[PDB]
Design a protein around this ligand. Structure first.
Ligand code: A1A6Q
Length: 167
C-alpha cells in the first residue's frame, strides 16, 4: 500500500492520473519523482522547468555541479539527484527529443531506467515539448517498465484520450 490517490489502473504495475506532477510530488513526497530531462540538465521548460521552479532553482544549481563534474548524460540515460522539497530523489531521465531529430527507438532505453526503482511518480517520456506521440509513449511505458509507475498527465484532454485509446 502506498499514498498515491485517484489513479486509474492500466496494468498490473502502471497507473495514470490527470494531475500536475509538481502538485502531486508536493502532496505525496514520493521516494522518486522522474524529471523529463535533457542531456545538459538545463531545466528551462516543460516538466523540467516546472519541477525546477518549484525547487526555487535548487535543482538547477545541483544539476550544474553534476554536469561540471560528469559531463552530459546520454539520450536514453539518467542520473539520480536530490528530490529537494518534492521527493526524496529525482531521477533525471533523457527521452529522445523529436524536435531535435533524436531516434524515437531510444524511448524504450529511457523507460528502462525506471526499472531500477521500485515505485516512481513520472511524466510520459518524450511527450509535451519533446515532440513524441504521447499515446506511443504510454505504450512503450507499459511494455517496458516492470516496477510500479504512477503517471501524471497535466492536460485533461490528453489524459482522456490516453485512457480511451488504451489497449
Ligand atoms: O508529458 C509531459 C511533457 O510534455 C507535456 C507534459 N507536461 C507535464 N506533465 C505533468 N505535470 C506537469 N507539470 C508541469 C508540466 C507537466
Amino acid at each position: 500500500v502506498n499514498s498515491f490517490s485517484g489513479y486509474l489502473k492500466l496494468t498490473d504495475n502502471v497507473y495514470i492520473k490527470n494531475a500536475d506532477i509538481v502538485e502531486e510530488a508536493k502532496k505525496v513526497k514520493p521516494t522518486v519523482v522522474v524529471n523529463a530531462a535533457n542531456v545538459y540538465l538545463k531545466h528551462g521548460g516543460g516538466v523540467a522547468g516546472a519541477l525546477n521552479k518549484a525547487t526555487n532553482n535548487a535543482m538547477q544549481v545541483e544539476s550544474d555541479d553534476y554536469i561540471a563534474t560528469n559531463g552530459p548524460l546520454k539520450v536514453g540515460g539518467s542520473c539520480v539527484l536530490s528530490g529537494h522539497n518534492l521527493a526524496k530523489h529525482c531521477l533525471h531521465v533523457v527521452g529522445p527529443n523529436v524536435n531535435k531529430g533524436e531516434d524515437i527507438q531510444l524511448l524504450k532505453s529511457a523507460y528502462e531506467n525506471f526499472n531500477q526503482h521500485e515505485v516512481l511518480l513520472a511524466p510520459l517520456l518524450s511527450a509535451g515539448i519533446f515532440g513524441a506521440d504521447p499515446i506511443h509513449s504510454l505504450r512503450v511505458c507499459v511494455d517496458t517498465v516492470r516496477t510500479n509507475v504512477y503517471l501524471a498527465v497535466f492536460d485533461k484532454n490528453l489524459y482522456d484520450k490516453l485512457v480511451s485509446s488504451f489497449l
